[PDB]
Amino acid sequence: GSIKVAVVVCLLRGQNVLLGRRRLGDSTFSLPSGHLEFGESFEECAARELKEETDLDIGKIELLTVTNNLFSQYVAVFMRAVLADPRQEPQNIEPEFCDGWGWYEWDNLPKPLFWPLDNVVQDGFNPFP
Ligand SMILES: CC(C)=CCC/C(C)=C/COP(=O)(O)OP(=O)(O)O
Numbered sequence: 001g002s003i004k005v006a007v008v009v010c011l012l013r014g015q016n017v018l019l020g021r022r023r024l025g026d027s028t029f030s031l032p033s034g035h036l037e038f039g040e041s042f043e044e045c046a047a048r049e050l051k052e053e054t055d056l057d058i059g060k061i062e063l064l065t066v067t068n069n070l071f072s073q074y075v076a077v078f079m080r081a082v083l084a085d086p087r088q089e090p091q092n093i094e095p096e097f098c099d100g101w102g103w104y105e106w107d108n109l110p111k112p113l114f115w116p117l118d119n120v121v122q123d124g125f126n127p128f129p
Helices: 042-054 115-122
Strands: 003-013 016-022 033-035 058-070 073-083 098-105
Touching (some): 003 042, 003 058, 042 058, 042 073, 042 098, 058 115
Antiparallel strands (some): 003 016, 058 073
């Protein structure tokens, strides 16, 4: 088995967080995520992932936590971020991997969540300052 590093992004706007419907974890709601590429910082990865998935330009990317996820095994580094221009909205650029993006309140997250995300929600994870 291989151990892989993913970066998972909590993109916040006000009291809302961006979630998408995955198309591993089919038809569950998840945060933007993807594989750290060699040479990247966590922050570069976060930005790249959001740009590839939604065309959104993010900033003020800050480390929150890290979790271990056995399935392969994923070490998932959770970052928070804001939009560089909060007037922008997500566009579903990769329909092969996602059915759509939306803004949700942490006190009313959609279900079902991708299980690695549910795991941290169960543990009291909250990305909002
Ligand atoms: C909070 C989360 C999601 C923790 C788990 C991290 C994880 C398995 C990401 C998968 O990356 P991906 O979106 O590129 O899918 P895949 O591994 O199938 O390529």
